[PDB]
Amino acid sequence: MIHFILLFSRQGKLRLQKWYITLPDKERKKITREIVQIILSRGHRTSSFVDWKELKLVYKRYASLYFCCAIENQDNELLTLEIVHRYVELLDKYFGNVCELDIIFNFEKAYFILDEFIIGGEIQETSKKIAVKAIEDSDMLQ
Amino acid sequence: EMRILMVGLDAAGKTTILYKLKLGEIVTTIPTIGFNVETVEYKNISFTVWDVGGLDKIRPLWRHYFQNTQGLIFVVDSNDRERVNEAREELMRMLAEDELRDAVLLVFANKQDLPNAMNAAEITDKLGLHSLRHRNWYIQATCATSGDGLYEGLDWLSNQLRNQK
Amino acid sequence: EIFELKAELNSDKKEKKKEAVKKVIASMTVGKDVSALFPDVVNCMQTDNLELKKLVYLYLMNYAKSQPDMAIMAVNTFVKDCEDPNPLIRALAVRTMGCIRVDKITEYLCEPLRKCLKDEDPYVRKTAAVCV
Amino acid sequence: EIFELKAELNSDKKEKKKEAVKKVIASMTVGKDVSALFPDVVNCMQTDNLELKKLVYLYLMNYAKSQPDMAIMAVNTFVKDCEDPNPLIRALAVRTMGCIRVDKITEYLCEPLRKCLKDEDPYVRKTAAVCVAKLHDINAQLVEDQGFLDTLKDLISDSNPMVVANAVAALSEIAESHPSSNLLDLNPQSINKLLTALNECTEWGQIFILDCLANYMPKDDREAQSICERVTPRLSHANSAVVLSAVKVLMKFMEMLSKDLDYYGTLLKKLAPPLVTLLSAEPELQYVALRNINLIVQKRPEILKHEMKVFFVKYNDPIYVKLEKLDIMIRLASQANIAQVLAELREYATEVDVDFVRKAVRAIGRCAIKVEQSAERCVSTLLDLIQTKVNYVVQEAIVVIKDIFRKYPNKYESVIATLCENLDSLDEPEARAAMIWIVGEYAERIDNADELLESFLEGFHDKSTQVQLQLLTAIVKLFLKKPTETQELVQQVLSLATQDSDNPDLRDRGYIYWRLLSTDPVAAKEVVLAEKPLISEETDLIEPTLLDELICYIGTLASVYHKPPSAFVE
Amino acid sequence: SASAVYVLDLKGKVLICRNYRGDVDMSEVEHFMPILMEKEEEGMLSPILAHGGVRFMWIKHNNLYLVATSKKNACVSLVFSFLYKVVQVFSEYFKELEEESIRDNFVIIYELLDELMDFGYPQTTDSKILQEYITQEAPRPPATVTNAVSWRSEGIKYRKNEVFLDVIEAVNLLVSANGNVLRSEIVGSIKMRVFLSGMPELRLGLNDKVLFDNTGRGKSKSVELEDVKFHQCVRLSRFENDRTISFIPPDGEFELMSYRLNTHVKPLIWIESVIEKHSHSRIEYMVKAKSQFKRRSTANNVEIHIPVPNDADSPKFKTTVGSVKWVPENSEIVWSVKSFPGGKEYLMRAHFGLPSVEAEDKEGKPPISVKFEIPYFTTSGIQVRYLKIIEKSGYQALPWVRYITQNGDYQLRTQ
Amino acid sequence: PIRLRELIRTIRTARTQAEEREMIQKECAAIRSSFREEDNTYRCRNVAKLLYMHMLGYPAHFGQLECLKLIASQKFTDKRIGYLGAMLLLDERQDVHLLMTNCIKNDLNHSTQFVQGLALCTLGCMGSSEMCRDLAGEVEKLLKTSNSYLRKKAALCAVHVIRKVPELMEMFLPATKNLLNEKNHGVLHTSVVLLTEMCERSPDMLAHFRKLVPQLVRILKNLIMSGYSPEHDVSGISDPFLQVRILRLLRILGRNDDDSSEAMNDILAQVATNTETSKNVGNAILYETVLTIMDIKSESGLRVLAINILGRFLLNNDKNIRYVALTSLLKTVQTDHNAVQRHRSTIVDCLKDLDVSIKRRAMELSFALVNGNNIRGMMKELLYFLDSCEPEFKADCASGIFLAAEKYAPSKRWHIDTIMRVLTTAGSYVRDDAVPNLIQLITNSVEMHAYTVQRLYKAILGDYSQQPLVQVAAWCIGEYGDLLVSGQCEEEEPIQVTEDEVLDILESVLISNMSTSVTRGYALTAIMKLSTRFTCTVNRIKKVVSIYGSSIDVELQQRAVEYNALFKKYDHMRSALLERMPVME
Ligand SMILES: Nc1nc2c(ncn2[C@@H]2O[C@H](COP(=O)(O)OP(=O)(O)OP(=O)(O)O)[C@@H](O)[C@H]2O)c(=O)[nH]1
Ligand SMILES: [Mg+2]
Question: Which UniProt keywords are listed (chain A)?
């Protein structure tokens, strides 16, 4: 079970937060600032795995913008990386050569790709075509 | 993602099987004087196809795609035993370059519907493809109006492109 | 310097080759010798962009005489682009074919001109009339 | 890329090598590794340009350690440039030679430094005086071998007191670096020469020549008064740093004055308005100023015992000033200023800074401890702050009212009738156990003391050691106060403590309480109900042997930290 | 006693760096901003940070951290006052002090940092004398650099000879929420603009209480100078002797004396207000503003700030005299009265809204601070008596003065 | 009323946060005065700018009324941004989120599957358990339909309402029956996640769901033998997401069954061979395969191949796969304890890795690797590793050495030797909870306290800043000083136990502020203990108690008073109650 989804820049600026566990905003800032401090203070041959507070945390560096999640520590761990890679391909297919400013200016569309890809922490569409087709159909409703 | 050519002698059906690969049609095609280019999204890999015709005046015009060239497909004409020797000498002129070495060979045994054609093995003997050092080559029996053998060449080409799962 | 521009040109992204050919026609605008970049912008011509191909036709017009031997790599693309649903790109290719003054090229340029004479839209017909 | 810059450097045009070395120091500005371009900018150093050679000296300073072997190619150029008509380039080369810390270089750097000591212009003399301390930082015994100490004493014996003041700064540094072998204390005649040097040298020099006075102690009443009469006008200076060192030497020298003479009270009354005025400085100096005020009001509390209105915090003040003004108000809380201080602290729990409010409640508690007169007004104010029912405010006020009850348990028996309802869902174990002590200690005017502990005995086995042990003591005290009601309660807390708990001191006190209850429970009326003495509180006055050492350090890092200097230096 | 003077950006990389002794390594500046965030988020934000045995003395500019590092027991107020003097000199040089001044005017600033300090020792930190041999547009250093009088170089000449005196009042005030004065002190500061010729000497005449007690004229109107802190240029031994302000003036703009006294006169502008803090609805500021001073002076451009709730909405202001701009960026109002005469009362009635849902945290209650400015008026009644120009040439300069009443931190606490 | 992206550019043109908060509060007051006019046109971009403020973390609590109003709107984009604001600004503890019930309920009955998609989306992401009890009758109704866009959302919304109300899962048992042949793999993925959740919750559901094992065996065989799909496909596998979920449902089912575990035998034997260890995805497939093998009661011949797989996973230079192999052998500790023990040199070799996680997992794997035979040689390198650790590893290692020594100690002498070596080399890094455990085991020892407390006194003479060390040592001195100071009532020939520095070391702990005051509680307890254990030097500790009667701590003042009354008044009761404390378990 994915407890949260975090997207933070290299400088530490929060670009996307998501909470699949309802913890309050002071706890949100505490946990978010802690995770931002942890991942930015770790090297480049460290497996992209952190055991942080009963969570086998799954992050990944794709660019200066860093991505972060944490699956429940009883599941497979590499599939969370495949989830993040699939969502990268979702942003690339709906946005088109997805820039940082595409994530900056059009963040709500990335939130909606996340909504039509994962609710509750789990994958709701495994097709890389049906999900982007459905969000382009919902955009076609406008 | 990777680029590719479709060269060979003229009237060998290479643009016919090209527009068979792009749309699934056999459209009316002139003997090609300039070039053609399309893109085929196949096995999630955009096969960017660069046809260069086989007219005599445009055979010396082959080096101006050979800058930044990754692959190769040489479409043979099986039914012409008279012109397959000059197509062989043309292939040996193209393959005698210090710049064309990443370009793997992919032989298309074409026009395989008439009884006068060679199989997918006699063409290799007439070419001597076993004597190809640094050439991942593969012959494949292709036909235009049926489209058979084209996707097998695309499959082997895609196996040459990716080195992943 | 021009190898960087040819490397931008020999890529596969539309926005890279687009800025590449805009830098080409900007060098041609002040009159820089961009004649050496002929046979590679020949390859970056058959595009679905209509704004891009006008720049390419401008280059081919300004360098038809400059490369009389390398210009044979466009006739198939002209007879393809004279077979398009858009009459703007058809009449554009027709008025490109007429201004290219190379006698090695204009032998194969009779029949698609004859077809565009017999087109339905008066735009490409009055273009092909001047191209005659 | 750097070969192009070295080719610009290896040319012969001034404008090419000038842009080359500007690109070098611009790469050094952002910190690019331009250490590889050392031995070729060494060649492009001896120029007639004066703007260019400062950049080169900057490079040599920033890369002296970087090329310890290639740096030998500059000594001839330094001894040439110390022989110039321009004193700016001479003193520039001298202050370059001092900051270059390479022991392979500084052997040949003694005699041109000695010559620039004996120069005519005071600019290069006061530069070379500091360069003597620079070399003594590099090699002390080479300076001792060359005898630069006597020349440093001869620039004390110089005119134009800037050279003298840099000599005093260098001597303070070198004698600090000494083991005090041949200590350089002065006769009072040279000290009066420094007093004549005081009204003339720079405001920075007026600090360092007051720093030599931290190493000298006068021997007479008239000598000390005679030098302090001209130390005294330094307190009316705009810079707080001259004023702070003058305060330091006056605190050092007021232990020589006769208190029965009227000059000592003259020193006392003329010192306090400068100390009040230094609070109007810019606030990073005010932090060290408040730490030094704390150092002074512990040494002499009679100085600021009438100035309370100025130590009130303001809204623009940062945390490191607002927390220290509270401590000064603690150190100056007296009998007559009780109302302003308590109403001021009452308006300090109304803030959003949590630690400031906690420190304010602790300040009200230390006020109730320090004076016995306004302990009751502290109790009333703290109960009205409990009436706010802010969680950390209550979590501090319970402990503070507890510590009021520990010192003064006497007439506070109707106060606990309100404290029974004090948001019993309190969470912090330092104040949960504090409330347990308040209940069990005062378990004769609290009638429902048994049933409230039923909440405290439910989740018993995982709270703390402190909270469980305070429960274990307070229930025994309650049961000794009432044997009828809590008969089951003391037995069940002994069963929870002795048998199932493995908390070792909790186990030991449980078996002790059980063996006491089984051996003679009536004897607990004398054993655990023994008359507690007056609790000797934690008086935070610094030791006067250490405080007099910290009189000798005012304005230092030890003055801030309220530590001995060797406790933190390395 | 700092070994390396540093200036960082707001992120923590080196804008400019200048080592002196090698006691602090150059790589240890990289720990500063992590230690800054580490101590800052726990309330341990101090001007002195530490990394093992290396200290970090710092003051803060708008975009710049003047980091001053030391390892041994540095003289601390030495370091901080030199940081302030570096700020003042660079503000004299670069009137805006930003990263564009550091990363582009880097030719002169390294020379400035080399000249102002050697081995961690400030030697010559005056701006005007440093102008005369450190330029960005070099000869020998002036003798005024080496002189005992190191604030006024000889050779200065003007056509006219004018001495401008600026007596600037600053009323410090902290009135509690009950309506009584907790502290009414006045920090006065005289700033002078002197345009004279050569090496003059100036003796300032003031209506001091202590000096008139030394004279015997202590029954008329005078000022009770509780404390004065002078410039370096004032000969302080003579002032200790007989209250004599004897100084060779510096050239141009300079602050002569910064005096401080306590004043039991009523405050200038009294602010009474009631706040009807209703739950989740609105707020009301029935604020009145009366002036207790005389009916002849008029307070220019006052800005009476009342701190407001942070999430207020639909602002309303039923005013009588003066405009309001609601400033929610600072979460306040600015009740601006341009011409505010003495002896008059101007009412203002504010009305806001308030969201129906509460916030997670509290907001705090900042006091009321106003921004009055009164010309031709001194609340202390301090008056300059004379100013004798002394010159070997001998002439008539023009000692001009104006009286200005401003505020310092004019605070009045809120409910 | 500026645009959202206009506020984005406004905040990105801010450098300083002291100015960026000013730029926040400007447009925030603009939004606030806009919400006083009840405007329903710009409310989309006003709430969007407010959510952009919440995303960077600015006060946006007030703009939840207008989020509910956007959900209570009628246009599609307004409802879209309203449900976005409901998922971002509202949670369980918001206290105002209970008004979404009627609006999501009418939007679960909305005609469009996308508006019902949003009503399922917000309820699945943050639907409270009170909202689960109010909406789960309509969640199953959108599972009683068959719209493949809606069934995938309704299945994971059912997972959510089980997650918040686990006593409401009985009404989805009749709703989940025999939808397990749906061709849409997204719906099939959410259904397999739902079955994995239902099998995780109740054993009563296992018997209904271990019957449909061969159905999903056929599904997984169809997905493994699927050579290629255009969608669902990363690295040549047709939907490996659903493959891992089916293997996980195979992992939790048959874990104590034999019939279903052999019903899944051959597909596991296939996917152990029809995976590919080249990219990340096939290594994930094969690791979930080996987890499914090691968690069911499989054939041990499968486990031979699976331990061959994990021995390959140790060999892979990818730190991903090294983490996976350490987690692998950390999972199969008790299952196949023998064949993991021959990976021991590799497990110890992974301790010298340059990652915190790999050192942590190899440390815990060496901890779980301890048996009754490897206790001698492994603990030497483990304590060498603790000596070569980092201060974050020292608590976990100091606990794990103690936990693996309390189980498999070959000699109680050497047990306490390893414990004392850890207490020296860790000091103030071990947890205080292990201190009564050490106390309990050394009082479970009965024959060696001379060798214990003499070595205790030999170590603690040098140090007292190691706080749990003296937490042990004060109770050790107070209980076994009679074995420490032995036969020394008066002055004899000099033995190193001296009964005057034995008290002075505790007194020096007392005077020193390096004392957590339960140091002082233990120490005064030891002082009162050693008045009967020692008759050698008495009436000097009574001086310490009498001068200690005015100390500043509360309990220590109580302790000094309650001691001093016994030491001055009831000396006949002191030796009566100073028996050793009895041994518990
Ligand atoms: N019977 C038969 N004829 C074929 C087949 N494929 C190609 N041809 C003939 O070969 C001719 C080749 O057409 P193109 O594709 O235009 O020739 P090309 O190989 O591209 O040669 P250029 O256009 O000059 O480059 C076609 O017109 C057909 O008549 C085939 O499969 N069967
Ligand atoms: Mg063709």
Answer: Coated pit, Cytoplasmic vesicle, Disease variant, Golgi apparatus, Membrane, Protein transport, Transport
The CATH number of whichever domain residue E301 belongs to comes to 2.60.40.1170
Helix (H, G, I), strand (E, B) or coil at E350: strand
In the numeric block, the tokens 């500091």 are attached to D130
Length of chain F: 585
- Closest of D440, D406, D453 to residue D528, by C-alpha: D440
F527 contacts chain A (CB < 8 A): no
CB contact under 8 A, C12 and B3: yes
**How far is Cα D15 from Cα A45, in angstroms, rounded to an integer?**
48
Residue A2's φ and ψ, nearest 5 degrees, are -75, 120
Q: Is the CB of residue D123 less than 8 Å from the CB of residue E146?
A: yes
State whether residue B112 sits within 8 Å of chain C by CB.
no
Side chain identity at F259, as an amino acid letter? Answer: D
Given resolution (angstroms): 6.7
Q: Is it the case that chain F and chain E have 3 or more CB pairs lying under 8 Å apart? A: yes
- Domain B1-163 part of CATH 3.40.640.10: no
Q: Report the CATH number at residue F121.
A: 1.25.10.10
Structure tokens at F187: 């719906």
Considering only CA atoms, give the Rg of chain D.
34
Partner-chain contact E329 F64, CB within 8 Å: no
Task: Tell me the DSSP string of F396-429.
Answer: HHHHHHHHHHHHS-S-HHHHHHHHHHHHHHTSTT
What secondary structure, in 3-state letters, does E70-124 show?
Answer: ECCCCEHHHHHHHHHHHHHHHHHHCCCCCHHHHCCCHHHHHHHHHHHEECCEECC
Residues in Cβ contact with E344 at an 8 Å cutoff, skipping those fewer than 6 apart:
E290, E291
List of residues 6+ apart from E328 with CB closer than 8 A: E308, E310, E312, F25, F26, F28, F29
Answer yes or no: do C75 and B57 touch at CB < 8 A.
no
> Which protein residues touch ligand 1 with a CB less than 6 Å away?
B 10-16, 29, 31-32, 53-55, 111, 113-114, 143-145
Range of the domain at E111: 4-131
Which protein residues have a CB closer than 5 Å to ligand 2 (ion)? B 15, 32
State the angle between helix axes of E106-116 and E76-93 in degrees (0 to 180), rounded to the nearest 10. 140
Mutate to test the interface with E, among F11, F61, F67 (most CBs of E within 10 A): F61
Domain hosting residue F515, numbered range = 1-585
Q: Which residue of F has its CA nearest to E280?
A: F62
Phi/psi for F21 (5° steps) reads -75, -30
The shortest CB-CB distance from D285 to any of E77, E178, E187 is to E77
DSSP annotation string for F460-497: HTT-S-SHHHHHHHHHHHHHHHHHHS-S-SS--S--S-
Count Cβ atoms within 10 A of the Cβ of residue D478 and give its class: 0-12 exposed, 13-18 middle, 19 or more buried.
Answer: buried
Binding positions of B for GTP are 8-16, 110-113, 144
Domain count of the fold of chain A: 1
Domains observed in chain D: 1-570 (1.25.10.10)
Provide, as residue numbers in chain F, all residues whose Cβ is less than 8 Å from the Cβ of D523: 570, 573
Query: How was it solved?
Result: cryo-EM
Q: How far is E24 from chain A (nearest CA, A)?
A: 24
CATH number for position A118: 3.30.450.60
Rounded Cα distance between E191 and F468, Å, is: 64
For A125, the domain range is 1-142
| Closest CA of chain E from A50, distance in Å | 21
Return the ligand 1 atom nearest residue B12 CA: 19
Q: Which of F475, F457, F462, F482 is nearest to F575 (CA)?
A: F482
Ligand 1 centroid distance, CA of F167 (Å): 71
Domains in chain F, number: 1
Residues ≥6 apart with Cβ < 8 Å to D280: E187, E260
Helix, strand, coil percentages in chain F from 3-state DSSP, rounded to 5: 65, 0, 35
Write out chain E residues lying below 8 Å of F25, CB-based. 310, 328-331
